[PDB]
Design an enzyme around this catalytic site. Structure first.
Site, PDB file in Angstrom:
ATOM      1  CD  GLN A 279     -77.938 -19.112  17.155  1.00  0.00           C
ATOM      2  OE1 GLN A 279     -77.503 -18.238  16.413  1.00  0.00           O
ATOM      3  NE2 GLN A 279     -78.192 -18.895  18.463  1.00  0.00           N
ATOM      4  NE  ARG A 292     -72.357 -15.672  22.660  1.00  0.00           N
ATOM      5  CZ  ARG A 292     -71.292 -14.881  22.546  1.00  0.00           C
ATOM      6  NH1 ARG A 292     -70.575 -14.473  23.637  1.00  0.00           N
ATOM      7  NH2 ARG A 292     -70.914 -14.508  21.353  1.00  0.00           N
ATOM      8  CB  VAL A 293     -73.416 -21.168  18.344  1.00  0.00           C
ATOM      9  CG1 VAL A 293     -72.940 -22.342  17.523  1.00  0.00           C
ATOM     10  CG2 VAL A 293     -74.743 -20.600  17.823  1.00  0.00           C
ATOM     11  CD1 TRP A 295     -69.550 -19.997  18.594  1.00  0.00           C
ATOM     12  CD2 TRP A 295     -67.774 -18.612  18.597  1.00  0.00           C
ATOM     13  NE1 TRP A 295     -70.018 -18.705  18.743  1.00  0.00           N
ATOM     14  CE2 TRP A 295     -68.948 -17.837  18.769  1.00  0.00           C
ATOM     15  CE3 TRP A 295     -66.525 -17.958  18.565  1.00  0.00           C
ATOM     16  CZ2 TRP A 295     -68.908 -16.462  18.888  1.00  0.00           C
ATOM     17  CZ3 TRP A 295     -66.485 -16.562  18.716  1.00  0.00           C
ATOM     18  CH2 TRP A 295     -67.674 -15.834  18.883  1.00  0.00           C
ATOM     19  CG  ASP A 396     -72.473 -13.988  13.434  1.00  0.00           C
ATOM     20  OD1 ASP A 396     -72.628 -12.794  13.188  1.00  0.00           O
ATOM     21  OD2 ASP A 396     -72.756 -14.459  14.535  1.00  0.00           O
ATOM     22  CD  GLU A 399     -68.659  -8.174  13.183  1.00  0.00           C
ATOM     23  OE1 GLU A 399     -69.776  -8.321  12.640  1.00  0.00           O
ATOM     24  OE2 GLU A 399     -68.176  -9.035  14.000  1.00  0.00           O
ATOM     25  CG  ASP A 463     -76.626  -9.025  17.165  1.00  0.00           C
ATOM     26  OD1 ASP A 463     -76.708  -9.728  16.113  1.00  0.00           O
ATOM     27  OD2 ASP A 463     -75.892  -9.339  18.115  1.00  0.00           O
ATOM     28  CG  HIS A 528     -82.302 -14.694  15.845  1.00  0.00           C
ATOM     29  ND1 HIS A 528     -82.051 -15.592  16.876  1.00  0.00           N
ATOM     30  CD2 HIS A 528     -81.079 -14.301  15.377  1.00  0.00           C
ATOM     31  CE1 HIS A 528     -80.738 -15.756  16.989  1.00  0.00           C
ATOM     32  NE2 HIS A 528     -80.117 -15.002  16.072  1.00  0.00           N
TER      33      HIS A 528
HETATM   34  O1  LIG Z   1     -74.237 -16.327  20.458  1.00  0.00           O
HETATM   35  S1  LIG Z   1     -73.472 -16.668  19.303  1.00  0.00           S
HETATM   36  O2  LIG Z   1     -72.306 -15.734  19.178  1.00  0.00           O
HETATM   37  O3  LIG Z   1     -72.911 -17.960  19.155  1.00  0.00           O
HETATM   38  C1  LIG Z   1     -74.448 -16.413  17.834  1.00  0.00           C
HETATM   39  C2  LIG Z   1     -75.200 -15.074  17.716  1.00  0.00           C
HETATM   40  C3  LIG Z   1     -74.266 -13.878  17.614  1.00  0.00           C
HETATM   41  N1  LIG Z   1     -74.167 -13.165  16.325  1.00  0.00           N
HETATM   42  C4  LIG Z   1     -75.474 -12.738  15.801  1.00  0.00           C
HETATM   43  C5  LIG Z   1     -76.660 -13.587  16.274  1.00  0.00           C
HETATM   44  O4  LIG Z   1     -77.679 -13.606  15.295  1.00  0.00           O
HETATM   45  C6  LIG Z   1     -76.258 -15.025  16.600  1.00  0.00           C
HETATM   46  O5  LIG Z   1     -77.429 -15.719  17.034  1.00  0.00           O
HETATM   47 CA   LIG Z   2     -77.445  -3.331  18.219  1.00  0.00          CA
END
Ligand SMILES: O=S(=O)(O)C[C@H]1CNC[C@@H](O)[C@@H]1O
Ligand SMILES: [Ca+2]
Length: 670
Positions: A279, A292-293, A295, A396, A399, A463, A528
């Site tokens: 990711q 986190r990623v 973006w 992803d 929402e 999640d 994951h």
């Molecule tokens: O932390 S991140 O928002 O970039 C990516 C995650 C959030 N959405 C679902 C997870 O599986 C991702 O790893």
């Molecule tokens: Ca949950």
């Protein structure tokens, strides 16, 4: 087919002999009114209240015969009225079109007749209930909750500073579509806020925050037939790429070398590996949540040197590379700047670009109602991911649209909020369709809305906590698969081991291996690291862990011919891959109440172990000739208990299956 009986201003409506509507002056079917929505969001969690101004029963009904059916003028004095049209549509479906007198009457409550014994399924992806009878269901896409039950400790902790714990009805994919055991479906076209209330024994009540409503119904003689009809209305998914069946997709972060090293460790130890999912292909952002990623949807050559050439080599070795995208753009990076330059972002009331707070950083919302922005973002996917050689990606979110954004199409964000997931799915789907990659590339989504049945190539359960809870652990994935199967989506997986790592929650080795046992009996295996990778036991944590993955990926790969056939049937007629037991055992009353077991295709029954510290498991078999997968022992219908150590999940197959000999080979794996 259609029996309308009018009379004292009272009527009934039957449709293929089902009683749908009844109305009299003392027992009306329709109320209208108005309210002022009070909706606020923080980091994807919504607080929703109505300031209700009026709610008024329309006791007077005047009927007339019409071009295609019947017109009913409902009223309460001259000042308050609505019209209902009753017809058939192009394909023979019952069609109800309701329009209030004016736009100021922005609330509707409609009651449909029901029987006390009826069960109700669907409403999208539901994680606490499969049968919905007895409770009400608000329908509004949001964050799904951490813990999701007010009586559990983690939910209380997630609620402490922030409205993040959630509740039984929170979901990434609510949908205004349900199935009754009177063997019909009801589908509502609206995307406004709605609450579908299935608690009264004698009626269902549908509440809408809008001045109009459109509903369609069809019946069938079997559930299988009803799902074929529902998917002919909403869409069917494509066949999966052939390589999905070939092993586990390893979730790995840390760059080119870390991916290579972990790949070799697993392959060299006998694990069947079909892919690497990274990711962080675009970079990372560290926050207090964890890792986190970044973006910004461009390959980062500092984190992933030579990724383009390395994908070519992996592909020659039978390994695909999968990445990550969402429909938002970090405010401190290039794609957001490019979108602001062109006017491609959702706006605020003053005409500026709206920046949403996503957890210690900000991002713009790409306005997918602007056709030029939607075209631009589809080109981003094609040029930055498809041309790089990715075999798929996590697609992803969806929402987080706030109700005080302003959109290019001029439709209120109160209406576009729920419609955003399928718009995002369509953007992915068309990227594939325009490059000739349908059936070769695979994307997977957590959010959805009406039409994701066509446009989403695969769902995952989003999640879960790294825990054993009923509402947000391993167990919660089974109602999620089943509810979506009943809403016309038949391809579903989960993160092997869960995701959310907070408070005292940390993934144990036992949880990882039990979740691996479950996923090997689904159509896709993918791991994951979680949001805090150093706090969780991972697929390479020790030699025993690695060996468990080699065994269970050999189990999954052995099933390839069977799974391929089931996926082809799902594509042809909407017959889902993971199935409620009542699809095939319609006269067994007890099967209508099960939440935590399923059929994989027609011939395999699975009851996953979802509690810590078990050495056995109790489940229900419907009446048939069954064989225990791991011992070969014969069983018939009834409540049963079996030994269930790690690596021997509770799985049974039909003795008379045409696939019996393949399933018999499973007990001889090491
Ligand atoms: O932390 S991140 O928002 O970039 C990516 C995650 C959030 N959405 C679902 C997870 O599986 C991702 O790893
Ligand atoms: Ca949950």
């Amino acid at each position: 087919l259609d029996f309308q009986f009018h009379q004292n201003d009272s009527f009934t409506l039957h449709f293929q002999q089902r009683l749908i509507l009844t109305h009299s002056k003392d027992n009306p079917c329709l109320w209208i009114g108005s309210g002022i929505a009070d909706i606020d969001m923080f980091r994807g969690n919504f607080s929703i209240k109505d300031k209700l101004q009026e709610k008024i029963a329309l006791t007077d009904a005047i009927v007339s015969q019409s071009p295609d059916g019947w017109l009913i003028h409902f009223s309460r004095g001259s000042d308050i009225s609505a019209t209902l049209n009753i017809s058939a549509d192009d394909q023979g479906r019952l069609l109800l079109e309701l329009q209030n007198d004016n736009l100021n009457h922005n609330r509707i409550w409609l009651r449909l007749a029901a029987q006390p014994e009826d069960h109700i399924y669907g409403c999208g992806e539901q994680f606490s209930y499969f049968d919905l009878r007895g409770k009400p269901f608000p329908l509004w896409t949001s964050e799904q909750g951490v813990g999701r039950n007010k009586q559990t400790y983690v939910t209380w902790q997630a609620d402490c500073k922030e409205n993040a714990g959630g509740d039984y009805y929170w979901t990434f994919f609510p949908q205004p579509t349900f199935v009754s055991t009177q063997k019909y479906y009801c589908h509502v076209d609206n995307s406004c806020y709605m609450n579908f209330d299935f608690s009264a024994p004698e009626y269902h009540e549908l509440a809408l925050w809008e001045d109009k409503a459109t509903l369609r119904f069809e019946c069938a003689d079997t559930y299988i037939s009803l799902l074929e009809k529902l998917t002919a209305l909403l869409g069917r998914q494509p066949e999966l790429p052939d390589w999905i069946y070939d092993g586990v997709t390893l979730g790995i972060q840390g760059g080119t070398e870390v991916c290579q090293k972990k790949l070799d460790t697993m392959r060299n130890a006998g694990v069947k590996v079909n892919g690497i999912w990274a990711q962080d292909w675009s970079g990372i952002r560290m926050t207090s949540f964890g890792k986190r990623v970044m973006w910004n949807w461009k390959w980062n050559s500092e984190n992933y040197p030579q990724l383009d050439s390395r994908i070519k080599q992996w592909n020659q070795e039978g390994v695909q590379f999968l990445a990550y995208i969402n429909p938002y753009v970090a405010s401190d990076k290039d794609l957001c700047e490019e979108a602001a330059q062109h006017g491609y972002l959702a706006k605020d009331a003053s005409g500026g670009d709206y920046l949403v707070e996503f957890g210690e950083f900000y991002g713009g919302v790409v306005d997918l109602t602007n056709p030029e922005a939607y075209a631009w973002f589809k080109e981003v996917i094609k040029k930055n991911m498809i041309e790089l050689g990715c075999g798929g990606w996590m697609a992803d979110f969806g929402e987080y649209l706030p109700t005080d954004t302003y959109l290019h199409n001029g439709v209120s964000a109160e209406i576009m909020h729920n419609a955003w997931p399928a718009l995002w799915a369509k953007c992915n789907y068309e990227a594939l369709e325009e490059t000739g990659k349908l059936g070769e590339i695979l994307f997977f989504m957590r959010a959805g809305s009406t039409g994701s049945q066509k446009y989403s190539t695969m769902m995952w359960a989003g999640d879960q906590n790294v825990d054993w809870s009923l509402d947000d652990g391993l167990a919660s994935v089974v109602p999620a698969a089943l509810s979506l199967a009943m809403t016309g989506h038949g391809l579903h997986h989960s993160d092997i081991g869960g995701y959310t790592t907070l408070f005292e929650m940390k993934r144990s080795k036992e949880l990882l291996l039990r979740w691996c046992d479950f996923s090997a009996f689904t159509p896709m295996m993918r791991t994951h690291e979680g949001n805090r990778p150093g706090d969780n036991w991972q697929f390479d944590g020790d030699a025993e862990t690695i060996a468990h993955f080699a065994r269970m990926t050999t189990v999954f790969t052995t099933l390839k011919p069977y799974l391929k056939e089931a996926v082809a049937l799902n594509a042809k007629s909407g017959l889902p891959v993971m199935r409620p037991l009542f699809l095939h055992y319609e006269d067994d009353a007890h099967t209508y109440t099960l939440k935590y077991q399923y059929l994989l295709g027609r011939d395999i029954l699975v009851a996953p172990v979802h509690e810590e510290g078990r050495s056995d498991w109790t489940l229900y078999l419907p009446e048939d000739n069954w064989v225990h997968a791991w011992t070969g022992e014969a069983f018939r219908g009834g409540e049963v208990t079996v030994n269930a150590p790690i690596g021997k999940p509770p799985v049974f197959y039909r003795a008379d299956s045409e696939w019996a000999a393949l399933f018999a080979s499973l007990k001889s794996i090491l």
